[PDB]
Design an enzyme around this catalytic site. Structure first.
Site, PDB file in Angstrom:
ATOM      1  N   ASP A   1      29.532  32.055  -4.752  1.00 32.91           N
ATOM      2  CA  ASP A   1      28.578  31.608  -5.755  1.00 32.91           C
ATOM      3  C   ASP A   1      27.529  30.774  -4.997  1.00 32.91           C
ATOM      4  OD1 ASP A   1      27.284  30.079  -7.727  1.00 32.91           O
ATOM      5  OD2 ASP A   1      29.001  30.225  -9.055  1.00 32.91           O
TER       6      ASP A   1
ATOM      7  N   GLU B   1      26.388  35.834  -7.556  1.00 33.26           N
ATOM      8  CA  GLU B   1      27.846  35.827  -7.459  1.00 33.26           C
ATOM      9  C   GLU B   1      28.406  37.177  -7.061  1.00 33.26           C
ATOM     10  OE1 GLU B   1      28.053  35.002 -11.654  1.00 33.26           O
ATOM     11  OE2 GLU B   1      29.352  33.317 -11.148  1.00 33.26           O
TER      12      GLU B   1
HETATM   13 CA    CA Z   1      28.647  30.957 -11.420  1.00 32.50          CA
HETATM   14 CA    CA Z   2      25.081  29.311  -8.299  1.00 36.52          CA
END
Ligand code: CA
Ligand code: CA
Ligand code: CTP
Ligand code: CA
EC number: 2.7.7.7
Length: 341
Positions: free
Chosen positions: A7, A106
């Site tokens: 992420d 992500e």
């Molecule tokens: Ca996220």
């Molecule tokens: Ca992020």
DNA sequence: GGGGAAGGAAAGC
DNA sequence: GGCTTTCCTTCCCC
């Protein structure tokens, strides 16, 4: 399964910092200017420096400016962020052929066949973080666990610029101690229906009667939570492919006058086709957000691809349907294409 | 009884 | 603000 989740940190704002290093250390706010008035629109995101003070994704640009009048406010440059994201995603493919790109920032990697345990998984995580830093100077957070949900929770606990493993022992602890509202998929509305039930821990979903749970939050979310609470959640990492592309624009002023609405609808169609780029949709939906902010849509699916000329003519009929069936005025108007050939 | 299609609900980015 | 995905509800139909 050993799932490694990536992420990217303060993504849009970080990309702007990479393109303009002088921004480092200053509060930076990426905005979505809607054009209705001076600073109308919302915050897409902000870097730490601004977020520390409450400037976060979703709040009105006007409110952000009240909080941090001297911050750097930048217009969203989605195309730039998308290109940068795409390059990072290509780096990640090198660590596993089983990769699920979940959003603009992500990705889930099934590294079960790549590492033997969490110690190795953790080391690979560091390798990945360093590789992305070396190549694009972008920091990210890595979450590692036995499945996608806990891998994501692990990243949540570690951001920003972190890395964390939630081993089997901790997964059991979390099933007991984690606020159920912090479980992916449980928003404000579901969290509220759950509270209504005494349920604020995953573990609580096992003792409540299934039908009671199901009637409140629906069968899918109930089975989801229960599977997690039983530590039997299993969802394979799978290649994702876009299923829909669209554009919605805010009108200068509300209206339900077809001729006044058309230019916006047509502009939305033009931009949508730009984004489709070679993908041919068989379905088109006209989407309208009413004055009171509700969302209404009318679509049509064709047995063939939709040419831009067909999109233009069909969009008008669909918008007409919306006007003939809904009495409210329209604030925003757009289109969404799907069912690609 | 239950799958499929349309439009709304809810969620996260 | 504005983009995309997935599940729910309702109704048609086998
Ligand atoms: Ca996220
Ligand atoms: Ca992020
Ligand atoms: N309502 C939202 C939430 C997110 N984003 C955008 O989607 C990207 C990332 O999602 P998110 O992880 O929520 O934002 P980050 O700024 O990367 O936050 P963090 O550093 O805490 O991971 C952001 O760069 C921005 C957006 O436009 N609108
Ligand atoms: Ca939540």
């Amino acid at each position: 399964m050993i799932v490694l989740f990536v992420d990217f940190d303060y993504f849009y704002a970080q990309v702007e910092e990479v393109l303009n290093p002088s921004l480092k250390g200053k509060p930076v706010v990426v905005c979505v200017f809607s054009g209705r008035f001076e600073d109308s629109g919302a915050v897409a995101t902000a870097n730490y420096e601004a977020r520390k003070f409450g400037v976060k994704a979703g709040i009105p640009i006007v409110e952000a400016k009240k909080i941090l009048p001297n911050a750097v406010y930048l217009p969203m440059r989605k195309e730039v962020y998308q290109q940068v994201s795409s390059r990072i995603m290509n780096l990640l493919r090198e660590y596993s052929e089983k990769i699920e790109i979940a959003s603009i920032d992500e990705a889930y990697l099934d590294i079960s066949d790549k590492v033997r345990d969490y110690r190795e998984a953790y080391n690979l995580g560091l390798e990945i973080k360093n590789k992305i830093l070396e190549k694009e100077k972008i920091t990210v957070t890595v979450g590692i666990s036995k499945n996608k949900v806990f891998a994501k929770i692990a990243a949540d606990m570690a951001k920003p610029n972190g890395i964390k493993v939630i081993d089997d022992e901790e997964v059991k602890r979390l099933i007991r101690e984690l606020d159920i509202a912090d479980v992916p998929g449980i928003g404000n509305i579901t969290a509220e229906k759950l509270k209504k039930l005494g349920i604020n821990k995953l573990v609580d979903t096992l003792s409540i009667e299934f039908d009671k749970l199901k009637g409140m939050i629906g069968e899918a979310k109930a089975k989801y939570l229960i599977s997690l609470a039983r530590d039997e959640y299993n969802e394979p990492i799978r290649t994702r492919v876009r299923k829909s592309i669209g554009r919605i624009v805010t009108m200068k002023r509300n209206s339900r006058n077809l001729e006044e609405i058309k230019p916006y609808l047509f502009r939305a169609i033009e931009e949508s086709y730009y984004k489709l780029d070679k993908r041919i949709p068989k379905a088109i939906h006209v989407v309208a957000v009413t004055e009171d902010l509700d969302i209404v849509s009318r679509g049509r699916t064709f047995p063939h691809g939709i040419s831009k000329e067909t999109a233009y003519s069909e969009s008008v009929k669909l918008l007409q349907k919306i006007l003939e069936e809904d009495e409210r005025k329209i604030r925003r108007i757009g289109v969404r294409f799907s069912k690609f050939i």
